Ligand binder design. Sequence first.
Ligand SMILES: [Mg+2]
Ligand SMILES: [Mg+2]
Ligand SMILES: [Mg+2]
Ligand SMILES: [Mg+2]
Ligand SMILES: [Mg+2]
Ligand SMILES: [Mg+2]
Ligand SMILES: [Mg+2]
Ligand SMILES: [Mg+2]
Ligand SMILES: [Mg+2]
Lengths: 606, 606, 606
Amino acid sequence: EWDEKTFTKFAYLSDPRTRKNLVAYVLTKANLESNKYENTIVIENLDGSRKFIEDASMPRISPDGKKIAFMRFNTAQIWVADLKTLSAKKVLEAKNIRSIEWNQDSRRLLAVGFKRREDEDFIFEDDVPAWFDNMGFFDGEKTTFWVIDTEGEEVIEQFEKPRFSSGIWHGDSIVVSVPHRDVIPRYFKYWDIYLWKDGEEEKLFEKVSFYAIDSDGERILLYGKPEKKYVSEHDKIYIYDGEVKGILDDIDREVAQAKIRNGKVYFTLFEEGSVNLYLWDGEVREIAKGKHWIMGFDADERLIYLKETATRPAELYLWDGEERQLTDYNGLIFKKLKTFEPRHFRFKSIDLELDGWYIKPEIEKAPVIVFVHGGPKGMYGYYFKYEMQLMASKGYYIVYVNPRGSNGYSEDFALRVLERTGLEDFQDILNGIEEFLRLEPQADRERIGITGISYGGYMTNWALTQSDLFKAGISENGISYWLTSYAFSDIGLWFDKEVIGDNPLENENYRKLSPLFYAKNVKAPLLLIHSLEDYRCPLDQSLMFYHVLKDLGKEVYIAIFKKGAHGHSIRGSPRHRMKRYKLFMEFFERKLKKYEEGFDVEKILK
Amino acid sequence: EWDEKTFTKFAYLSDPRTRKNLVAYVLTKANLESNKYENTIVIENLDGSRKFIEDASMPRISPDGKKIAFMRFNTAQIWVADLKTLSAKKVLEAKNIRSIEWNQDSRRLLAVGFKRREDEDFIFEDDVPAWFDNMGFFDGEKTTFWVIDTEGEEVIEQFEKPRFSSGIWHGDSIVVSVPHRDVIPRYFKYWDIYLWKDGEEEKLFEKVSFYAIDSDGERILLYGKPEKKYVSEHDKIYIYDGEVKGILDDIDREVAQAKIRNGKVYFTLFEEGSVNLYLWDGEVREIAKGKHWIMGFDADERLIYLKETATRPAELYLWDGEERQLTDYNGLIFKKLKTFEPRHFRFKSIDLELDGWYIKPEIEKAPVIVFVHGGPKGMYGYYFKYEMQLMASKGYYIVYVNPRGSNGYSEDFALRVLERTGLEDFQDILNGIEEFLRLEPQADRERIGITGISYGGYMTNWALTQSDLFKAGISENGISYWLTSYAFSDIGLWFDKEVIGDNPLENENYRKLSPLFYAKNVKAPLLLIHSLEDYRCPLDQSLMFYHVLKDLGKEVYIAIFKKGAHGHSIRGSPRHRMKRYKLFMEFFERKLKKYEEGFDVEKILK
Amino acid sequence: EWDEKTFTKFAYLSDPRTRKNLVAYVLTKANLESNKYENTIVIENLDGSRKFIEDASMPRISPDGKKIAFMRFNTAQIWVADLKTLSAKKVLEAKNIRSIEWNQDSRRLLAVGFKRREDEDFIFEDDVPAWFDNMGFFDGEKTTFWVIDTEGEEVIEQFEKPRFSSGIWHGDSIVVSVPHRDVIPRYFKYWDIYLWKDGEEEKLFEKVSFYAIDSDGERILLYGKPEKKYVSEHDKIYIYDGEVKGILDDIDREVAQAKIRNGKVYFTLFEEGSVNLYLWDGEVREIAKGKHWIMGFDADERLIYLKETATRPAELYLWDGEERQLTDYNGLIFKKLKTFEPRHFRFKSIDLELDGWYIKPEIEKAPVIVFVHGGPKGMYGYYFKYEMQLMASKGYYIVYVNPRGSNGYSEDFALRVLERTGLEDFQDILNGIEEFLRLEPQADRERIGITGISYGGYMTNWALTQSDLFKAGISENGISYWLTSYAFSDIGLWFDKEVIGDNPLENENYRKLSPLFYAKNVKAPLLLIHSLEDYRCPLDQSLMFYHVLKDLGKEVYIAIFKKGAHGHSIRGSPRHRMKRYKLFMEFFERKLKKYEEGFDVEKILK
Ligand SMILES: [Mg+2]
Ligand SMILES: [Mg+2]
Ligand SMILES: [Mg+2]
Ligand SMILES: [Mg+2]
Ligand SMILES: [Mg+2]
Ligand SMILES: [Mg+2]
Ligand SMILES: [Mg+2]
Ligand SMILES: [Mg+2]
Ligand SMILES: [Mg+2]
């Protein structure tokens, strides 16, 4: 049976790594009773023999295949284990490390972390932004780079860089990507790239729209473009060996992840609902393309990847030749648990033809939940979406589309949304719902709800202020006012200028496209959901909407989770997440399936 | 030198398991200074290479030999380790699990446990009995069955059954043995047996006197009889594959343990003082028969067993072909510690000829301690009996017999005791002592003591009320009044009806054969020993005898151990057990070897 | 509204003391949320000015009125405070002190306590009984006497005496009352009395049936008789000044409490349902006589006492001249809480006329709960009985009587019960119920239940085995088998010989008058309630009855409280007591008011 606890039953795989004949990855479990994620590194032969590093993550297999570094968290500590016996030693006790990567010598690690002011009474800020979702307040944060010798166990080189810099090995050098500073740092837009060795550095690029993501010791793999006008442009990949060479210049899709392994580049593309795995070895070759999301991959002598589908969390695969499924962690649970395959439909919207999906429940007519993805350059299609399976099992149609602005299509399709949030993209959603209703006469047009997180939250607010179609909404971590998004959120300073418009203090678009200013129009009951550590869409986006809607006599409720960032629906504590799922299902049960007055959360939850 | 601490010096082996070329078992040590049992799983090659899983028990080797599940206790947790490197992951945090067993797939475990009401202020009972020795109060206890997937780490099936049910895998099915319910559950007498799979079940047997103990995936091994009139009847073994086939119908001895391994059944028999290991492969073949107790065994590609003798705790052996001793954990200790081999004697008693044993000390005449085993269907012979070696080292003859009622002989011999406790079986003991005294003129007939636990405690009480032969007694966890045994103990409701008689509220036998009612006859000093968590023979059995004996002016003492069940002499904490051994030896020193007035335990113990 | 929590709302007063113009007493509150009794000493002027010693009890005001000793518990510590400012110093850190009493010098205290063997693993006993209700296992307990100098803060004299001795000051001497030892100590029957000073002693009495309870420095007040044949005989009081003088020889009622204050004796008598306060100053004078229980009193320059009634817990009063109520702790609570005054009725039973009471609810007919008091020499009448008010508020008639055997009447009436438990006294109960039913036609004869604790538990068991009148019973801490009461309980060795009969191992009365042996007769559902530290009626009394009743197919349930002695219904933790009250009310709701099958305590309680 699907309910608010079902997500705790799945094994969650991440961070796959492979060297020689070995694969490692992390197995994570949500333990509802201790209220903790549990992490286990699993190392597999390729045999199917498994061994374990318990209470650990960040597996990094040494280039020589003889050992594995990993992190245990608590302060964090870096450990190194022999892969033969897995006997381990603690190497470095590390607060605030975000990455470790072996040097080609299988002796040194590069660790990138951060340092802040850390006064126990006040944060002090002189740069921007003051905070970032999932990181906290910056408090003057600088990036730190440590070269650690894992034999002697010492930091043998260290240097700092501006906030939000990154570093990868390039042979015995380090390629350092630093946000370019103009009036403010040009986050996500321009970087300066350096080559660093032994306390000295050479600037490789100045003010470019890509950063270094991998190296094979001869070539540097760069991610982005040489110059973007919009951060929303499709990120591409480039090889640099002295000359910068685009390897996908003729493919009008965005790269999701990429790695270089002896001059061959493995990479994934967002494509019409899927995230597909390709290889480039002079030409682009399809590796794993279908109705799925390749969530992660790694390549050395072998190529392994994590593939998630609409109805299964990610499992591990090995590519031959041919795809071979390596793991089946959830196979036994899913023998007993019904899932629902989405049905793809094309529909016309204004000038375009778009992708939609719906899931039909067993079935009278059935109520309908419309889901809107975040972004706007998010993408729905073929990954595992817990709420959708959950509500389909409870008797709802689920419908959702990729409006213009979505990832997975041409760059132009993504960029059509800019300065037009709530305009054509909302029409796309309404037109997809109209086509879905034509396809499915058993969908009850008189019981359609809408929900989404982030931009989907924005769109749920917007939908209730612009349309009388919806009977209920659940809007989460959303946007009701772009001006405060611009001035308050971690990314607003550059992101809103692009997506909403320039001259934000004068531009009328900031109120014209803001649900807050049309609150009077709202007629359907609404549940707002927010979390107190969300800095991507800060609390005022929900609480202002909630207060103004109350000031106008509207039926509205707000659940404010005391912990959690923007992605807390998926990343918050298991107990936190269970409570959100329960609220979510009960709001729709009691406001969409069959309207009931009030919403007594004490009685409803326990 | 033997004393109250010597038992802490031995290594105690248990729970042997074998798959392919591997053996595992548990090594337990009594640590007197931390006052804890320590458990180490040892895995041996077969090489004699050893490896270790520390602070753990319940080794279960997966059918494929690639891994080992085990328990660590504290709440209990199930872990799974790769047998190659022994790297381990925690699979399930498990309060109240009593068994784990792998499925043939080496992926799922079946765990059988229990659940109770657990109010912190009161136990509430609506079934029977309210408590069970070594388990506590039932508090509404149900049995729970969990199928655990050890990859994904989740319970994927669970169901509950009445109290005291058991479960074993049968291929992908579970055979569930449940006590049959009439007016009360017919514990130890009738079961219903089910075949369970995927939430459904078929009843295989109704109200039978056997339960399922093993399976080879085609055949179910059943333990008991199709129908017993008396629970005291010899348990036998049956193979069920559609038809129930007795495999020892022509052998009039009781099976102690049995396992099925690809259509071959390995099993032990109680026989005249020994517990011997046999194989059935169409005919019964002797494997390990002699003056010893096969305490445990396991078979897969190899057959291993634990063999204990009168003078050595259990050591591990492998059977070829020929018996090979694999371990010698206590060999070095026993080079320095004198032991005493018992001398077997036959004697006549009324209509029968019986087995007796005695140990002769160095040697004047020497005082004599007569030991009486529990049961009555207990059995003395060739296992390691700490008190016997201990008191023999201190200058005592030790004598003990198997009276009628004992295990190890024909069923009829066992059943002669029923309704006759303290009658012929006591005469058997007196006749064995008479023959022993004839054999050993250096035994001092004027200094004979008697002691026993459980039924042996009953018999020590009884002996002091019926005979003037004994100069002292130590009676432990015994019986002085059958009526309260019937109505108060965990098993009395069915057990006393069989062993003492029907219509217990009217049957005069319940007082006629009860030491309490002859307390006036007592002339020898007596130490009573009890423990507060003994529900097999509850406290009133000792304390009523103690109070009535004091009320009659008799010299009697009672030591009431604040923790511990019926078997606390062997299972209580090392400090608890050391104190009991010390009391036991000192009572006999000061009341049997040389009578001394009083018994100042403060001075005597420390 | 009355429910399982209402008892927590009352202030409970105890231990009144008075010197000069001061009164002190203890105010106790049951705090359900911390689950603790809270104790506050209150000192009142006589003004009505109040002051406080918080978290303390055992107020002892010094003879000179200048200071107050008291105990704080945790180990216990004796403190002394100046009564003017209540500034306090700790005098002696005291494990196991049971009493403190000032010497006439207002400098020394006499503290009487106890010491035991205290091995952490086992209790060791060589005397009798092994345990006592509300004290635990004796573990070789001796009585200790300490003279404490409260200035220098030192024990300046100490000596020990047999278990269960007591001591009071007599000027600079100590009168020591010690149980007389024959085959066993003659507890509650004969004492030896000593006069002790400065390490020497003179025996004042040998083997007498009284002990010293107070002194005025010239006269010793003795409680009991010079010689009792039965402990059940009425205790009287005597003044000893060289000659023993009976002061109530012509009053055929038992003294409940007595104190001597400059040759005047204040004392209470059990009389037909009341406990009344008298003075003797050469003649007996009535002080406080009525429908009430004088729970405690003290006299110096003033006379104060605690008076409880059927409808109010005890409040404090001062006697002038005339009774003046001093406190009204519960007056505000009882403005809001309905109470029910019992209605007294006379009835004929065989050869006697007896007292009964009933409470009529608002009112169809109403179901009836018959309550039976403990003892048998207990007494119902005019004290505050929580369950009665509780069940009357829930729509039940409450009826209860003083059968022969009760205190409050002639000695002969008390002694009629001896060897006749369950015979005439049970007929008395049946005849009282018959008269009550005639008085109250709205009582539903088809819904009568019975309940009691202790002897009342015995009688509830007995009632269900002998009568078909009752539709339900709740039997608590009761008797189902006298033989085990005799041999197992703290007092059985002497108490059962008197109340049930001599030669307990042969006397057929022990089974003839035992509910256990008539268990087959039971037809009404029964809840048994017991507690694991009850040594007055040990657990087997309930659990044997429960098991045998289950063995006979009867509907019976048992609630076994994990902590608590015989009086745990009133003395157990507030949470423990709340749960018992809830069970008690729900059993009657669901088995007496309207029979319902089953009894799911999980659902019923929470
Ligand atoms: Mg280190
Ligand atoms: Mg991008
Ligand atoms: Mg373009
Ligand atoms: Mg785990
Ligand atoms: Mg058997
Ligand atoms: Mg036979
Ligand atoms: Mg002091
Ligand atoms: Mg009395
Ligand atoms: Mg008389």
